[PDB]
Amino acid sequence: VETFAFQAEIAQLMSLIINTFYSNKEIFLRELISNSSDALDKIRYESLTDPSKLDSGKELHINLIPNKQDRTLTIVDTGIGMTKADLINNLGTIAKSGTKAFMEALQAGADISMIGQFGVGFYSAYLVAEKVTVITKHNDDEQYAWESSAGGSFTVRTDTGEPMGRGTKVILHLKEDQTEYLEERRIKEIVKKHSQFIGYPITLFVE
Amino acid sequence: VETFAFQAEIAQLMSLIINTFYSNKEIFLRELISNSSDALDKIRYESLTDPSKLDSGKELHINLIPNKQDRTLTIVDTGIGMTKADLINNLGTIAKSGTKAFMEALQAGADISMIGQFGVGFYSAYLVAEKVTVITKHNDDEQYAWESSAGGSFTVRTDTGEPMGRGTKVILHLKEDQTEYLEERRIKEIVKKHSQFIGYPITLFVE
Numbered sequence: 001v002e003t004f005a006f007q008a009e010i011a012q013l014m015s016l017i018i019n020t021f022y023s024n025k026e027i028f029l030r031e032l033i034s035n036s037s038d039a040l041d042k043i044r045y046e047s048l049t050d051p052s053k054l055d056s057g058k059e060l061h062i063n064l065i066p067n068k069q070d071r072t073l074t075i076v077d078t079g080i081g082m083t084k085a086d087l088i089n090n091l092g093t094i095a096k097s098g099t100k101a102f103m104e105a106l107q108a109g110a111d112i113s114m115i116g117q118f119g120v121g122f123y124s125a126y127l128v129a130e131k132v133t134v135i136t137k138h139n140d141d142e143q144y145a146w147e148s149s150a151g152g153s154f155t156v157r158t159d160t161g162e163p164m165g166r167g168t169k170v171i172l173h174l175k176e177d178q179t180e181y182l183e184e185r186r187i188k189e190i191v192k193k194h195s196q197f198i199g200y201p202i203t204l205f206v207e
Numbered sequence: 208v209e210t211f212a213f214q215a216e217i218a219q220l221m222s223l224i225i226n227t228f229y230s231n232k233e234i235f236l237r238e239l240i241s242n243s244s245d246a247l248d249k250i251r252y253e254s255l256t257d258p259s260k261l262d263s264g265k266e267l268h269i270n271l272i273p274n275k276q277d278r279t280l281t282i283v284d285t286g287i288g289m290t291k292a293d294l295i296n297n298l299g300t301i302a303k304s305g306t307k308a309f310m311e312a313l314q315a316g317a318d319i320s321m322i323g324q325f326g327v328g329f330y331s332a333y334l335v336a337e338k339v340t341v342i343t344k345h346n347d348d349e350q351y352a353w354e355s356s357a358g359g360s361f362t363v364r365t366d367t368g369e370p371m372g373r374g375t376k377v378i379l380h381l382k383e384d385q386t387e388y389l390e391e392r393r394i395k396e397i398v399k400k401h402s403q404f405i406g407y408p409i410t411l412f413v414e
């Protein structure tokens with residue numbers, strides 16, 4: 001188990017998300033489904049020239065899994081996934097994101113719902129989650145589990161409990177007052193409202 | 208000069224953009240600036256682990272150049288740029304884009320302004336330009352000029368007259384009735400409305 005400190009600006013962004021009273025929090029689903037869709041476009045494209053890239057699963061889709069017993073909402077995709085390096089870079093540092101631009105925009109009156117246009121929509125998960133676990137498997141690496149309850153640090157460790165072929169699973173450990181996002185009606189309404197045009201199947205699992 | 212045929216779907220997409228009646232054409236500027244911004248994020252990020260990546264130019268910015276004499280509007284950035292292969296593949300085919308989903312979205316009520324969400328915002332240039340020329344220089348290749356007036360084909364040839372160091376320049380050869388986008392007041396208005404939060408300087412050249 002390795003522990004890392006988020007780059008300062010990312011930590012700052014995360015605190016802002018957790019401490020703000022933004023009302024339209026439902027957009028966290030749109031942002032994660034968007035990320036999944038983009039990850040799916042990637043593997044789809046690479047497979048165009050390297051058919052073997054799909055030996056780890058040819059099906060390209062997105063699964064939404066609510067569990068009221070564990071109070072978690074999980075977003076799963078069979079996209080390109082992330083290597084260990086990808087996890088530490090894409091999720092722990094500004095990297096290619098517009099973190100700085102986004103934080104400055106918020107000070108200038110920008111809206112939180114625009115978070116996705118700055119390449120940091122993942123973090124909106126903290127609008128409704130106290131902790132986020134990310135399990136991912138990329139064709140070029142082994143399976144890994146990333147995790148953070150904010151506070152400035154995150155952990156990464158190899159995940160061997162149950163192989164997933166290829167993709168990313170974002171597990172949202174919901175805040176006590178955000179359980180509405182586990183209700184079928186609520187989830188369906190959100191998907192129809194913000195992700196109706198996604199070019200991949202989105203299946204809502206029944207509990 | 209090499210002449211290529213667009214992938215069928217891409218030709219179909221450009222056709223939908225050129226023939227559909229849609230008055231809110233101003234979004235083309237937001238889409239091009241967004242591409243420039245993302246291309247800057249990419250070189251900014253790569254330069255983190257490899258400072259030499261900026262030997263071809265450390266300044267990261269976007270320039271908007273109007274010319275009423277040549278009836279052109281040029282969007283230039285000092286982003287990562289595109290290799291020859293990148294031009295042919297990224298502008299000539301679906302690649303990792305959401306071309307398929309966008310065309311389906313349009314037939315399902317989606318709006319053309321939503322084009323950028325599907326990774327094909329570049330083609331919105333055709334909302335106002337009869338011809339588009341793309342001059343680009345990537346660190347790992349020579350300078351090339353891509354060009355198309357739609358019609359199902361595009362050309363690529365080496366460019367030399369004037370080296371740019373690194374980046375991309377999108378030259379919009381405007382349609383006779385779209386000269387408003389050459390007016391300083393019009394451009395300033397569009398930038399404030401759709402690109403006020405970009406994290407890179409956007410300089411509007413004076414005529």
Ligand SMILES: Cc1cc(CNS(=O)(=O)c2cccc(N/C=C3\CCOC3=O)c2)nc(N)n1
Binds near residue numbers: 038039040090
């Ligand atoms: C984060 C992430 C990464 C990937 C696979 N990698 S990708 O290159 O295809 C990919 C696909 C879509 C988004 C990202 N990066 C997003 C970020 C970075 C920080 O905050 C964000 O929102 C990466 N899939 C999924 N579902 N989520």
Ligand SMILES: Cc1cc(CNS(=O)(=O)c2cccc(N/C=C3\CCOC3=O)c2)nc(N)n1
Binds near residue numbers: 289298
């Ligand atoms: C198209 C393009 C590409 C790049 C440099 N490459 S990038 O990987 O950093 C890059 C940055 C932003 C967007 C893209 N691809 C966009 C596309 C493809 C089909 O239609 C679109 O809209 C590529 N810079 C600029 N200014 N424009």
